Amino acid sequence: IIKKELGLEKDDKDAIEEKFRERLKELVVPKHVMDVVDEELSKLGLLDNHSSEFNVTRNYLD
Amino acid sequence: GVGKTSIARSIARALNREYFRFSVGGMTDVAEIKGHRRTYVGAMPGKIIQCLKKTKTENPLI
Ligand SMILES: Nc1ncnc2c1ncn2[C@@H]1O[C@H](COP(=O)(O)OP(=O)(O)O)[C@@H](O)[C@H]1O
């Protein structure tokens, strides 16, 4: 109850999702790269937080 | 752009069995064929499962 969407509810990866989306929100972003970023985020959610390929994905999206 | 996919669609119509199409182009990860073990949150079935589910048949035209 204390959480109210705090702490464990961020998952440490959807935080990256939100960070990237807000970072590119002000940008008038191309639709193509928009869907590519969506695919990258989908893979981010499809990959664990403790692996090398996930780190490479995070770096590429960075 | 020669209608090959349209040929497949017409064959499916002439065979009364559903139509589905799949893209293997440049894919290297057999995961999309085999999905993922479902253990990982975000793991997904292989596209064949999606095809069979949508086509609603065990004798579709793939
Ligand atoms: N001989 C043909 N008769 C009818 N339609 C054709 C023919 N050749 C090409 N087309 C057209 O091509 C379109 C689909 O092309 P597509 O199958 O995507 O090309 P490719 O097979 O090279 O991928 C269809 O809308 C279809 O009407």
As a 3-state breakdown, chain B gives helix, strand, coil percent values, each rounded to 5, of 40, 5, 55
Task: Report d(CA B41, CA B33) in Å as an integer.
Answer: 18
| B10-40: burial string, b at 16+ Cβ within 10 Å, e else | eebeeeeebbbeeeeeeeeeeebeebeeeee
What residues have CB less than 8 Å from B20, skipping those under 6 apart? Answer: B51, B54, B55, B60, B61, B62
CA nearest to A14, candidates A44, A38, A35: A44
Residues of B in contact with A47 (CB under 8 A): 42
Give phi and psi for B61, each to the nearest 5: -100, 105
Task: Report d(CA B35, CA B59) in Å as an integer.
Answer: 21
Q: Please name the method used to determine this structure.
A: cryo-EM
Q: What's the gap in Å between B7 CA and the centre of ligand 1?
A: 7
* Residue the block writes with tokens 């209608």: B3
Closest ligand 1 atom, residue B7 Cα: 17
Report yes or no: A44 and A57 within 8 Å, Cβ to Cβ. Answer: yes
Reported resolution, Å:
3.9
